[PDB]
Amino acid sequence: ILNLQNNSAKYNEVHRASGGAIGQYTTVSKLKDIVILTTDSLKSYLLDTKIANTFQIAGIDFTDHVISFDDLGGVFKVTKEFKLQNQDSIDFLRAYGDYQSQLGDTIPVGAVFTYDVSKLKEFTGNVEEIKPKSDLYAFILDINSIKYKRYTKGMLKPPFHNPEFDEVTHWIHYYSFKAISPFFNKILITDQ
Amino acid sequence: GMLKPPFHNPEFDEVTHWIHYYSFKAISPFFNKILITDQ
Amino acid sequence: VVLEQRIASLEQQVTTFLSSQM
Amino acid sequence: VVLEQRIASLEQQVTTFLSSQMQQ
Amino acid sequence: VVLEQRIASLEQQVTTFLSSQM
Amino acid sequence: VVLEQRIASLEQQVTTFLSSQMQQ
Amino acid sequence: VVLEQRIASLEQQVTTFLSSQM
Amino acid sequence: RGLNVELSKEISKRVVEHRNRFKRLMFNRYLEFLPLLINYTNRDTVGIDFIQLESALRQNINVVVGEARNKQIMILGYQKRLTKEDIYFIVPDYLIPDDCLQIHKLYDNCMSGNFVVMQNKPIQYNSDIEIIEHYTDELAEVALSRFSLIMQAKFSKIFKSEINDESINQLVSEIYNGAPFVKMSPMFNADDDIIDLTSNSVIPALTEMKREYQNKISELSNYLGINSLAVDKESGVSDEEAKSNRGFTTSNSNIYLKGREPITFLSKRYGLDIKPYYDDETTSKISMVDTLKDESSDING
Amino acid sequence: RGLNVELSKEISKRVVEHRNRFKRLMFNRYLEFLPLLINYTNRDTVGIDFIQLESALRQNINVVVGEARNKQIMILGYQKRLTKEDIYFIVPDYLIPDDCLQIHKLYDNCMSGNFVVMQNKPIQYNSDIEIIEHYTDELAEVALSRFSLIMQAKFSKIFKSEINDESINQLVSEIYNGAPFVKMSPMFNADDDIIDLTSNSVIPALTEMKREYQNKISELSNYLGINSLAVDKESGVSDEEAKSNRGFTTSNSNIYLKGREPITFLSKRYGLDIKPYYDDETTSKISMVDTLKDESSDING
Amino acid sequence: AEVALSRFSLIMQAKFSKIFKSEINDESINQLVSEIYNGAPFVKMSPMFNADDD
Amino acid sequence: IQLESALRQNINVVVGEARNKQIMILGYQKRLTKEDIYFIVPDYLIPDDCLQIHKLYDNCMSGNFVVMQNKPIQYNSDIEIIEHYTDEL
Amino acid sequence: FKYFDDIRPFLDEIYKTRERYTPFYDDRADYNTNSKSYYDYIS
Amino acid sequence: TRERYTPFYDDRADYNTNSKSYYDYIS
Amino acid sequence: TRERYTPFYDDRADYNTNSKSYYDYIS
Amino acid sequence: NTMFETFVN
Amino acid sequence: MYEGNNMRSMMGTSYEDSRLNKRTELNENMSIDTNKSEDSYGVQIHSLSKQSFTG
Amino acid sequence: ELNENMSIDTNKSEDSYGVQIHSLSKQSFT
C-alpha cells in the first residue's frame, strides 16, 4: 500500500486494454479509496496478532479498509454447456426458487449459482467453484476500479390478480452491471 | 511563457499546441552527504 | 424562509448535540 | 434584510462542516 | 460595488502582510 | 461618486503591481 | 473634456521641462 | 502494413454506414432530449433539480418528493392500500425525515405529511422507448433513400468519338474555356454524337422523398406529445395542412401532464403554486416581442 | 525545372478539389461558430468572459463558476453524492477561494457558497461534432453536384462545313459583327447545317439542386438548435412552407438552454438576474425599428 | 394496421439504383469510379454505343 | 476605418488610453497580460505607465488596453472562402 | 552471423495489414479509386 | 472502416461438392 | 496542385503475367 | 520539396 | 535602456515575463497527503466514496 | 437496498473491553 501511492507505471492492467498494448501509462492511489479483500480468518489474525501485538499503532492500523467474508466462495461457475436430465436435480432447483427450469433446458457458461449445488450428477465435472486454493488471499484495490450499476426504476411490477383461482401474483425485476476497470492499481497476494 | 500561442492548420483544420520550459538541476559538491549500500 | 432557516439551525444544533455530551 | 442573507450563509457553512466529521 | 471594492482592498492588504513582517 | 472610480482604479494598480513581485 | 484638456496641458508642460532646465 | 482496398463500390458500404449511423444517432438523440419537456414553473421556491427528476421519470421509476427539512428534496419510491411509512428506498444521506411520512393524495386534500409519488404516465401500457425504436428504423431507411438518391444525382457530358486525339482539342479549347462558335468537320461530329447522361428521373423524386422524411418526423413527434400545437392554433393552419389530426396530438401531450399531476397535490400542501406546464419557448426574440418595460432593454441591448 | 501537365481533364481534379475543400471549410466553419449561441444577458454585472465559457462548454468540459473575490471568475470542474471542497482542477492563479466552497444546487435554493457546474447538455448521449461530420459529407457531395452542373453549363454554336475558308468569312462578317441579311449559296448551307449544342437538360436540373442544398442546410440547422424560429412565428409561415416541423426545432433549441440552467442557480445566490437567452439578433436596423427616444438618433446618425 | 403495413412496404421498396450494363470484366468500372461518383463532367467514351441508353 | 482594415488581416489590435483618448495600438487556460511588452505603433503618446487588459481582472476597473479579435474562435480565414466562390462565380 | 530465425513469424508478415483510417473526402486520395492501394501494396 | 481485402493469395484445396446448393452440401 | 506528369520516359522491363487480373498476379 | 502550410495570402 | 518602441508584436515583447500561467503544481500532494500511512487506529471500515471522474 | 448497516454497525469485534457480563438481551418479537 506504500507502493501503490507513488508515481509509477506499474500495478495497473493498462496493458490488457485496447490501445495500451505498446505504451506506458502511470497512475497513483490516494488511500482514501483503497480497500483490501481477504477472508475473515485473515482479518481475525491481524486483529488478533498484528495490531494487537505490535506496541505502536499510532496511525499504523489499516483495518478500516478490510472487507471480510466467512469464505470467498459459495458461488459455482458453469463449464461445458449441457442439458439437464434428472427430475431430482430440477425439484432440487425448485427448493431455491427456480420455477422455470424443466427437462428441456440447457445451461450456458454465462451463469452462476451462488449456492452449493455441485453434488448433483448433472453438475459434477461441468460446474466448478470460485475459491483461492491457498486461502492466504489478499486482493487490494481502490474503489474507483470496481463499478456497480444497479437499476431499480421499475422496481415493483403491478400485481396480477387472477380471481378465478383467487390468487394474486407479484414480480420483482432489477438490473445490475457489476464490472471492474483495469485502469487502476491492483495487487493480488496468494501462495499460488 | 510556458505555453506558447497555438497554431491552427486550416489545411487539415487542426490545432497544435507546444509546451516549452527551461529546467536546470545540479548537485553542489560543497555539502555533506553519505551513502549506504552494497557496492 | 425565516422559519425554514430557524428549523435548519435547530436541526444542526441537534446534530451537534448528538455527537458530543459537551 | 442583509442579516437574513448572512445568517443563511453561515448556517450552510456550519452544516457543510459538520457533515465533514459527522456520524451521518 | 463598494462592498466588493472594500473586500478587494482587504485581500490586497492581507497579501501585502503575508510577504513582509513590517 | 468620482472618488469611487479613482479608488477602484488605484486598487487595481496596487493589485497588478503586487502580483509582479508576489509569492502567488 | 475639460479634464482631458487639463491632462494634455500637463503632459505638454512635462515634455517641455524634459528638454530644457530653464 | 496491410492494405488491399475493395473497389469503388466502397460507396455501397459507405451508404449503409450512413443509414446505420443515422438510426443510432436519431434514436439516442431522441431519448437524449425526451426527459425534458415539462419543467413546470421552474424553481419557484422548491429545491428540486427538475432535470434530475425528469431523467428519473423516463426510466419509469416512481420518484417521491416530500419534505426533508421543509424544502422538498427528491426521494425514490419503489383497490387502494395506503402507503405511510418510510419503507421505500431513500437516496439522500442525512436529510431523511425520521418521522411520520405519508402519501398526501386521498387522506385529505391538503393536510397529511408529504411524500407524494409521481408516475411518468398515469396508466402504463407500453414503454415509449419501444415506439422510438419503432419509427427510427423506418426513418432510417427513408434517410437511406434520400442519401442514395442525392449520391447518384451527379451529371457528366459524355463525348463520343474514336479515341486518340480528335475530340480532346475540341472540348479543351472550345467548351470549358467557354468559347462559342466552334467549327467542326461534316462527319456528323455533333449530330447527337456528344450526349448527356442526365438523372431527371431522380430530381422530381427528390422533393417528395424529403416530404416523406418530414411528415414521418412529425408522425413520431405528435405521438410522444412534442408538438407545434399552440402556435398552430394562433396561426390558423389548424387542420389538413399540418397533416397531424390535432385531436390526437393534444391527446398524447396531455397524458404526460396528468401523469405529473401529484406535484399539484404537493403544491396544495405547503401553500405554493406548481403547475405542470408544457415547454415550447425559445428566446431572445419571443422574450422581446412579449415585452417590447425599459429594463428589458438594459438586459439584452 | 519539372513540368508536364496532364490534359484538360485537370478540371476533373479541380472539381474534386472544390468538393474536398468545401467539406473541410463547412465542417470547421460550423464548429467555428457553434460555441456562441446563447450569451445570456451579456455581462450584466458578472465577470465572465462568456466567449471563453461557451468555447469551453462545447468541448464538454464541465466548467464551474463560483466566487473568487465576490466576482465570479470561471474555474474548471472535472443517485447523488455531493461535491463540496475545492478538490477539482483550478485554472486561475491566486484568486482561489481558499475557503469553504460548495455546489449551490440542492443543498438549498439560494444559500450555499457558490461553485456551480454547468453541463453542455443535461443528459449526454452523442457529441454533436459527429452530427456535424454526419451531414457535411452529404452536403459536400451535393455541393459537388452543383459545381459540376454549372461547370458544364456552357454553350457553343457549332458551325459545320468542309473546312478551309468557306464558312469562316460568313461568321466573321455576318454573325459576331451582328449583321442581319447574310446571303448564302443554295448548297443547303444553313439547312440545319449550323447546329447548337445546348444543355437544356441541365438548367431545369439546376434550381432543384439548389433547393436540395438549401433544405439540407436547414436540416442540419434545426438539429443543432440554430433556427429561424421566432420570426417564423410572427411571419405566419409556420408549417410546411419552412419544411422543418417546428415542434422538433423548438425541441432541439431548448436542450442547450436547460443545459446551462445552473447559471440561474448561481443567479439566485448573489441576487442578480441571469437568464440563458438564445441569440437571434443582428443590428442597425432591428435596433432602429425597436426604438424609432431621440438619443438613439445621435448614436447612429 | 394494414394501412400502416402498406405505408411501410411502400417506403421500403422506394430505393433507387443506377444500373450499369456492360460485358463484365473491367470495361465500365473505371468509368463510374473516375467519372461519376468523383463527380467528373466530360467523360470520354468509345463509339460502341457505350451509353446509347446502355 | 483603419481599425477594421487592421482587423481583417487578423492582427489583434489593442485600444487603450494614450492621453485619456483611446488611440489604437497593435497587440501581438488564461495567462494574463499586463505590461506594454507588445509592439506599439504611435510615437510619443505611449502610456509609459501601468497598462493592463481590462477583461476579467474586474468588470470595469483596470487600466485599459483591450485586444479585439476579428473572430472569437479562428478556424479558417475568409480570404479563402472569397477565393472559393469567386472562381465558381 | 548465421541465424535460422524461425519460419512462422515471417510468413505472417506477407499476410498482415494495419488498416489505418485514411479519411474519405480529402486530397490524400482524390478520386479514391482502387489504384493507390495497389501501388502501396506491391511496393 | 473502408473494408479492404489486404491479403490476396493463392490456394491449394480442391472441390466438387456433389450437391444442389451450398445448403444441401452443409446437410 | 495542378497534377502534372513532369517526367515522361522510356522503360526496359518486361511482362507477361500469366494471371487473370492484377489481383491474382499479386497472389 | 513542399508539404506546407501558410495562408492568409 | 533604449526605448524605440520596445513593444513590437511578438518576441520583442517576449523578453519579459510573457504571461506566467499554470505553473507546475503539487495541488495533489505526494509525500504528505498521499504516500501516507499514518492512518488512525479506527473502529470500522465505514465507506470509500466512489466518484465517476467526469472532470 | 441496505437499510440496517452491515460492516459498520455490524462486522465489529473492535468494540468490547469491559470486565463485565450481560449482553444477554432477549428482545421482544413481532
Q: Which long-range contacts (CB under 8 A, 24 or more apart) does A90-95 make?
A: A92/A117, A92/A120
Task: Test Q11 with P47 for CB contact under 8 angstroms.
Answer: no
Contact criterion met (CB below 8 Å) for A71 and A131: yes
Q: Is I219 helix (H, G, I), strand (E, B) or coil?
A: helix
| Residues in CB range of I93: below 8 A, 6 or more apart | F24, K32, P21
Cβ neighbours, 10 Å, residue H207: 14
In 3D space, the residue among H157, H196, H178 whose CA is nearest the CA of residue I155 turns out to be H178
DSSP element (H, E) containing B15: strand B14-16
In 3D space, the residue among I171, I180, I138, I140 whose CA is nearest the CA of residue I26 turns out to be I140
List chain L residues with CB under 8 Å of I138. Answer: none
For M13: left if phi > 0, alpha if psi spans -120 to 50, otherwise beta; the answer is: beta
Distances from the Cα of I300 to the Cαs of H292, H300, I290, I294, K21, in angstroms?
20, 18, 14, 11, 21
Bridge partners for B16 per DSSP: B7
φ, ψ at J3 (rounded to 5°): -75, -25
Chain L interface test: which of J28, J32, J38 (most L C-beta within 10 Å): J38
For I210: left if phi > 0, alpha if psi spans -120 to 50, otherwise beta; the answer is: alpha
Q: In whole angstroms, what is the distance from residue H271 CA to residue H232 CA?
A: 35
Distances from the Cα of I18 to the Cαs of H15, I21, I29, I272, J39, in angstroms?
22, 5, 16, 51, 11
Chains M vs A: touching, with 3+ CB pairs under 8 Å?
A: no
Q: Å from H171 to nearest chain M CA?
A: 36
**Grid coordinates in use for F1?**
461618486
Q: In whole angstroms, what is the distance from residue I244 CA to residue I228 CA?
A: 10
Q: In whole angstroms, what is the distance from residue H261 CA to residue H275 CA?
A: 8
CA H15, H16, H19, H21 dihedral sign is negative
| Residues in CB range of I272: below 8 A, 6 or more apart | I44, I45, I46
List chain I residues with CB under 8 Å of B10. Answer: 24, 28
Burial I51-86 (b: 16+ CB within 10 A, else e): ebbbebbbebebbbbbbbbebbbbbbbeeeeebbeb
Distances from the Cα of G18 to the Cαs of G15, I37, J36, K47, K77, in angstroms?
5, 53, 78, 16, 47
Beta J44-45 vs H156-160: how paired, if at all?
Answer: parallel
Nearest Cβ partner for P13 among K11, K29, K39: K39
Contact criterion met (CB below 8 Å) for I149 and I209: yes
Chains J vs H: touching, with 3+ CB pairs under 8 Å?
A: yes
Bridge partners for A83 per DSSP: A106
Nearest Cβ partner for B3 among K29, K76, K77: K29
Q: Å from A89 to nearest chain Q CA?
A: 31
Q: Is C16 helix (H, G, I), strand (E, B) or coil?
A: helix
DSSP element (H, E) containing I76: strand I74-76
φ, ψ at H117 (rounded to 5°): -95, 140
Task: Test H145 with J35 for CB contact under 8 angstroms.
Answer: no
* Secondary structure in 3-state letters for chain H: CCCCECCCCCHHHHHHHHHHHHHHHHHHHHHHHCCCCCCCCCCCCCCCCHHHHHHHHCCCCCEEEECCCCCCCEEECCCCCCCCCCCCCCCCCCCCCCCCCCCCCCCCCCCCCCEEEECCCCCCCCCHHHHHHHHHHHHHHHHHHHHHHHHCCCCEEEEECCCCCCCHHHHHHHHHCCCCCCEECCCCCCCCCCEEECCCCCHHHHHHHHHHHHHHHHHHHCCCCCCCHHHHHHHCCCCCCCCCCHHHHHHHCHHHHCCCCHHHHHHHHCCCCCCCCCCCCCCCCHHHHCCCCCHHHHHHC
Bridge partners for H156 per DSSP: H197
Q: In whole angstroms, what is the distance from residue A41 CA to residue H41 CA?
A: 58
DSSP element (H, E) containing L37: helix L36-42
Query: Residue F6: what residue type?
Result: R
Chain L interface test: which of J26, J28, J31, J33 (most L C-beta within 10 Å): J33
Q: In whole angstroms, what is the distance from residue H224 CA to residue H222 CA?
A: 6
Task: Test K71 with I32 for CB contact under 8 angstroms.
Answer: yes
Q: Å from M13 to nearest chain N CA?
A: 15
List chain B residues with CB under 8 Å of P12. Answer: none
**Grid coordinates in use for I146?**
452543383
Contact criterion met (CB below 8 Å) for H202 and J16: yes
Q: In whole angstroms, what is the distance from residue A139 CA to residue I259 CA?
A: 41
Q: Is A150 helix (H, G, I), strand (E, B) or coil?
A: strand
CB distance from J30 to chain L under 8 Å?
Answer: yes
**Grid coordinates in use for K76?**
479558417
DSSP element (H, E) containing A37: strand A36-37
Burial class of I227 by CB neighbour count within 10 A (0 to 12, 13 to 18, 19+) = buried
DSSP string, O1-9: ---------
Task: Test O9 with K9 for CB contact under 8 angstroms.
Answer: no
Q: In whole angstroms, what is the distance from residue A68 CA to residue Q11 CA?
A: 8
Q: In whole angstroms, what is the distance from residue I152 CA to residue H154 CA?
A: 12
Cell 466562390, residue located: K85
Q: In whole angstroms, what is the distance from residue A2 CA to residue A114 CA?
A: 35
Angle among Cα H192, H195, H201 to the nearest 5 degrees reads 125
In 3D space, the residue among A63, C20, I272 whose CA is nearest the CA of residue P39 turns out to be A63
In 3D space, the residue among A119, A112, A115 whose CA is nearest the CA of residue A89 turns out to be A119
Q: Is I196 helix (H, G, I), strand (E, B) or coil?
A: strand
**Torsion of Cα atoms, I119 then I121 then I126 then I130, to 10°:** -90
- Give CA H282 to chain center in angstroms: 15
CA A20, A21, A26, A30 dihedral sign is positive
Q: In whole angstroms, what is the distance from residue I244 CA to residue A104 CA?
A: 55
Q: In whole angstroms, what is the distance from residue H266 CA to residue H273 CA?
A: 9
For A122: left if phi > 0, alpha if psi spans -120 to 50, otherwise beta; the answer is: alpha
Contact criterion met (CB below 8 Å) for H33 and I251: yes
CB distance from F16 to chain E under 8 Å?
Answer: no
Nearest Cβ partner for Q14 among P44, P46, P47: P44
Contact criterion met (CB below 8 Å) for I114 and I269: yes
Q: How many Cα neighbours within 13 Å face the side chain of H283?
A: 18
Cβ neighbours, 10 Å, residue I266: 23
Q: Is I64 helix (H, G, I), strand (E, B) or coil?
A: strand
Q: Which chains touch G (3 or more CB pairs under 8 A)?
A: K
Task: Test Q12 with P45 for CB contact under 8 angstroms.
Answer: no
Q: In whole angstroms, what is the distance from residue I263 CA to residue H269 CA?
A: 29
Beta A82-83 vs A106-107: how paired, if at all?
Answer: antiparallel
**Grid coordinates in use for I224?**
443543432
Q: How many Cα neighbours within 13 Å face the side chain of D10?
A: 6
Q: In what order do the strands lie in the sheet with K24-26?
A: K24-26, K13-16, K65-68
DSSP element (H, E) containing A94: helix A87-94
Contact criterion met (CB below 8 Å) for A138 and A36: yes
List chain H residues with CB under 8 Å of M8. Answer: 4
Chain L interface test: which of H4, H5, H13 (most L C-beta within 10 Å): H5
Contact criterion met (CB below 8 Å) for J41 and I15: yes
DSSP element (H, E) containing I288: helix I286-289
| Residues in CB range of G15: below 8 A, 6 or more apart | K44
Which residue in chain O has the smallest CA separation from K81? Answer: O8
- Give CA F10 to chain center in angstroms: 4
**Grid coordinates in use for H284?**
431572445
Interface size between H and M, measured as CB pairs under 8 A = 19
Query: Residue B12: what residue type?
Result: F
Task: Test N1 with I4 for CB contact under 8 angstroms.
Answer: no
CB distance from I19 to chain J under 8 Å?
Answer: yes
CB distance from K85 to chain I under 8 Å?
Answer: no
For H43: left if phi > 0, alpha if psi spans -120 to 50, otherwise beta; the answer is: left
DSSP string, I106-172: SS-SS-SPPEEEE-SSSS--S-HHHHHHHHHHHHHHHHHHHHHHHHS---EEEEE--STTSSHHHHI
Query: Residue I78: what residue type?
Result: Y
Burial Q1-30 (b: 16+ CB within 10 A, else e): eeeeeeeeeebeeeeeeeeeeeeeeeeeee
Q: In whole angstroms, what is the distance from residue I277 CA to residue I265 CA?
A: 15
Q: Å from I94 to nearest chain F CA?
A: 6
Cell 452440401, residue located: M25
Cβ neighbours, 10 Å, residue I294: 7
Q: In whole angstroms, what is the distance from residue I173 CA to residue I163 CA?
A: 17
